[PDB]
A paper describes a structure:
Reduced glutathione (GSH) provides the cellular first line of defense against oxidative stress-induced injury, which can be maintained by NADPH generated mainly via the pentose phosphate pathway and its rate-limiting enzyme, glucose-6-phosphate dehydrogenase ([name]). Accordingly, missense DNA mutations that impair [name] activity or stability result in increased oxidative stress and a spectrum of disease phenotypes featuring, most commonly, hemolytic anemia, and collectively called [name] deficiency. Each monomer has a catalytic nicotinamide adenine dinucleotide phosphate (NADP+)-binding domain and β+α domain, containing an additional binding site for NADP+ that structurally stabilizes the enzyme. The glucose 6-phosphate (G6P)-binding site is located between these two domains.
We first began our efforts focusing on the Canton variant, with the mutation R459L, located in the β+α domain. Canton [name] is prevalent in China and Southeast Asia (50–60% of the variants), causing severe deficiency (class II). Recombinant Canton [name] enzyme showed only 18% of normal [name] activity with lower KM for both NADP+ and G6P, which is consistent with the biochemical characteristics analyzed using blood samples derived from subjects carrying the Canton variant. Furthermore, the Canton variant was less thermostable; its T1/2, the temperature at which the enzyme retains half of its catalytic activity, was 42.6 °C, which is 4.6 °C lower than T1/2 of WT enzyme. To elucidate the molecular basis of the reduced stability and activity of Canton [name], we examined the crystal structures of WT and Canton [name] at 1.9 Å and 2.6 Å resolution, respectively. Although no NADP+ was added to protein solution prior to the crystallization, both crystal structures contained NADP+ at the second NADP+-binding site (structural NADP+-binding site) in the β+α domain. However, we noticed a loose helical interaction between the helix (αn), containing the Canton variant-R459L, and an adjacent helix (αe), which was not described in previously reported structures. In WT [name], R459 forms electrostatic and hydrogen bond interactions with D181 and N185 on the adjacent helix (αe), whereas Canton mutation does not, resulting in loosened inter-helical interactions and displacements of the helix (αe) and a proceeding loop consisting of K171, P172, F173, G174, and R175, several amino acids away from R459-interacting residues on the helix (αe). Thus, the loose inter-helical interaction in the Canton variant is likely to be a major driving force for positioning the loop and thus changing the orientations of these residues. Canton [name] was more susceptible to degradation by chymotrypsin relative to the WT enzyme, which corresponded with a significantly decreased enzymatic activity. This suggests that Canton [name] may undergo higher conformational fluctuation, leading to a greater accessibility to proteases and its reduced thermostability.
Residue numbers in the entry:
A (entry chain C): 28 to 514
B (entry chain L): 28 to 513
Amino acid sequence: QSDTHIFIIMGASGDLAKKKIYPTIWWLFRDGLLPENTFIVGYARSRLTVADIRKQSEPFFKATPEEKLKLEDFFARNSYVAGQYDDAASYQRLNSHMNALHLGSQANRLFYLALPPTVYEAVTKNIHESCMSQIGWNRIIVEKPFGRDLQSSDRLSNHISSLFREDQIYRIDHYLGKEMVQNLMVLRFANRIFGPIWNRDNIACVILTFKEPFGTEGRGGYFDEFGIIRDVMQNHLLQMLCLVAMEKPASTNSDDVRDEKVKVLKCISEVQANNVVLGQYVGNPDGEGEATKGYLDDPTVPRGSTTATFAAVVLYVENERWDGVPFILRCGKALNERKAEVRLQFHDVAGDIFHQQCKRNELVIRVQPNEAVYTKMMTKKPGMFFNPEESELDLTYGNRYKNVKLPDAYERLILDVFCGSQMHFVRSDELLEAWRIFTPLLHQIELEKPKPIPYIYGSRGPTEADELMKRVGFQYEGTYKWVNPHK
Amino acid sequence: QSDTHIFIIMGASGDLAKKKIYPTIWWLFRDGLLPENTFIVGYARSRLTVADIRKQSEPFFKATPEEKLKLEDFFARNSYVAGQYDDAASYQRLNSHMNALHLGSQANRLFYLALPPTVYEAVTKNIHESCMSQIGWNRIIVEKPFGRDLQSSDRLSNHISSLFREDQIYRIDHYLGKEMVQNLMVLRFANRIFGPIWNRDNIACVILTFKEPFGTEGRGGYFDEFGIIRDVMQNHLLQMLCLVAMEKPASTNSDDVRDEKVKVLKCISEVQANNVVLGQYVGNPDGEGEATKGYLDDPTVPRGSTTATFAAVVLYVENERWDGVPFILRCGKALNERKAEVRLQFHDVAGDIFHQQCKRNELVIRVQPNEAVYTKMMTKKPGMFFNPEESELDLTYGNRYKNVKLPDAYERLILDVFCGSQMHFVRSDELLEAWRIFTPLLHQIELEKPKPIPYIYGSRGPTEADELMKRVGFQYEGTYKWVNPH
Ligand SMILES: NC(=O)c1ccc[n+]([C@@H]2O[C@H](COP(=O)([O-])OP(=O)(O)OC[C@H]3O[C@@H](n4cnc5c(N)ncnc54)[C@H](OP(=O)(O)O)[C@@H]3O)[C@@H](O)[C@H]2O)c1
Ligand SMILES: NC(=O)c1ccc[n+]([C@@H]2O[C@H](COP(=O)([O-])OP(=O)(O)OC[C@H]3O[C@@H](n4cnc5c(N)ncnc54)[C@H](OP(=O)(O)O)[C@@H]3O)[C@@H](O)[C@H]2O)c1
């Protein structure tokens, strides 16, 4: 209905807040998607005013001059409270400030933790002691739900769970807010053309890909603590794997869906080192600008670091649907393109009557850029020719839906929290299983410090990764030629 | 491939020859697709010269001025022989003329029967005394129509068969030479995404469609003898049905493929009248030109005619793959568009979790115009929206293959005859089965003369046809919106 909502941005002065959260909540406000009675409260160490956080963040709002009236109305709904992250008195002031807003004691409260995770423990304790509505609901959004290692994450998880119910905790994986990632469920479960085919009798392998064309861009020091597997694979690619592999849920209820995601992960064995390839980028002497510098040429990165900037890992789901089908998770920085993508490669047809001219069908869901889905298949070569040739059936959102704005993942996810939908957020048991799967590998890496394989900035990464894909059953012939039609 | 070939156009002065056959053989010649030692011989009643048939046919060649050298070379390989169709002496002259060409007694001979079918019997008898190579092969190409009912077709078939072996007879159904019709086999059997889904457990119905937007165009008299079922359904749509329904052949050998087509038809029961809707177009008083005239306003059409210009018929294939799946054959003249198309509508997904917002998937293979294949499916509605919406995965040859000429069906088929491939040609037993399926219905129509349902020129036809489709399981909601991605 028209209840009052308070959106509290913890860490309001920090960069996640100023470049992403404040702009996102502004976009939702200006499109009429928030409850009419919404207030925004910033909280952080510095002693700021609203005018300060406005000056600091409005640069990222992309505000047209036509939006000035709405922009005034948005900042009239903003306030700020200065406080330390582990000072009970500061949180008492925050709670009073909230109770002093229109219907504050009654309002629903939404706490966005846009802070360093080293402080999550203190902030969650203090929010739960001083700041919960006695009447409205209380939800917290946790931005980095993974710690460094199973033990440190698990203690943080038990801490949060001893205070907050699972239906109050919204753990972010921002890929779950992307257009095509959400589309996986509909593509799979709303269509018969993809149902009977979606199993080990027809799928030869699955490939989940994340590529960025830039390196650590002078901020390698923050990255070096994590490495590419923690940064991108254990969270984003594993989430994509679940959506591709899950059985059909009893309904689209949040917990029916997340049950099926967790069920998939429970059937994955711990990754074996024999199925892993690690890489680290070096500079391209023939490139320009940042491309000439290797990972180790960033002076914020410890000298000699063996941290991986590229990884390819093969996982198996041991259940009736997927037994033996390799899931290849492939990710890296400083590669040849920006791309995130899901690919299924189907088996050869049985009983070939075309004299080995057929290639394997593939289904591709491209998450970014240029959101698209397409299916690579065989058609009779056009013209006076009898023989088959690869082509595709295509849906490209930029052509087919020219005028439709696809929202940023954070717009969608923040809105889901106002709505009470946990479906696109990571559940505790999902987190635990992700840790189980990767922990032995990560522990072995930390102990043995293996030297990753060098690859040149701007390339596709270590050729060993392609050999790994080939070994487990992916085929690449390089004969497919695509010419853009809507050009 | 380095032997001598003789292409004989019987009925060289007639219109099929001048507008279609002479140009087609020219196109094959100019693209380098014929054997290097090929001669073209015309034969017909009139006393013409090559210069005559050139003047008469070159208008349809679409010859650029750059092609003059090849055009000269083509006509230097042409000749003409005048003769009657039932005169032993005329065929003796034709045979001598052929023996006098380069290696003629040895050459392979390809007879194109571009004549009225009232003369097939005489021409075939005379060719197979007189004109066969004793050394090379001998093949004849027969255009439609192959009898009006089972009895007349069967007598014609037995006549031709008592002279010629089945591997000498090339019965044309020109749809089998079209790009997307030939593509049906590859789409189905080269791809795993279409294999497991291609059966009664996943397909709710199949729809085979032929639409023309013009009526009989003042030549209704010729049409009235046949009606739309004989003109278009028993041949073109039934052939499409076979390609859509056949089991995977042992190979792409002609006879392995045609075996599977015949096997499908052997499992089809005789059509019952309760599964048929017939229509006849009437004029649109609000239109212009030909569109204001009904079928009966053509003065070449007999007064009172009840002949159908539209028909929708439901067939069933009673075998393990298709039991109970309705195949809807829908065709008509004077409709709202030109279109030939195959559509599969898949069943609803079981265990709906989307609150009845899903629509049935469809696979469409569009034969003409704008050759394309697309699959209508559900995607999450783009933007800030949770719910499914129809979209499609598309392949449109005009965009994807901008620079690729798709040949005319006759180019491809004539070339197949030079090559000895009977795969895209109608076999005797296919013909017999098509007659078995339709003959009782056609006999009932001729006896009871039911009055077909009127429909206005330029419409989609009788609304009773849509009711028939709905009754047997096709669903149409009309919610799908397609915008061209240019
Ligand atoms: N709607 C559309 O926009 C649309 C539709 C169809 C095709 N296309 C475009 O056409 C191009 C081809 O499409 P595609 O990539 O799906 O087909 P593809 O060229 O066959 O690439 C398929 C997969 O093979 C990988 N690969 C490349 N070289 C390899 C090697 N030596 N060993 C092992 N794997 C190798 C690629 O790696 P990487 O991922 O690392 O490249 C990719 O994962 C792409 O640029 C695509 O964006 C676009
Ligand atoms: N690559 C492409 O060019 C491409 C791709 C996708 C879509 N499109 C276009 O988008 C449009 C719609 O596509 P579509 O025809 O596949 O889907 P559709 O319009 O949903 O048509 C589906 C079928 O339902 C029939 N129908 C129409 N009204 C009916 C009624 N009242 N009761 C029962 N049946 C009825 C149509 O008949 P008729 O056949 O008699 O119309 C057609 O056979 C078409 O213009 C199509 O050309 C084009």
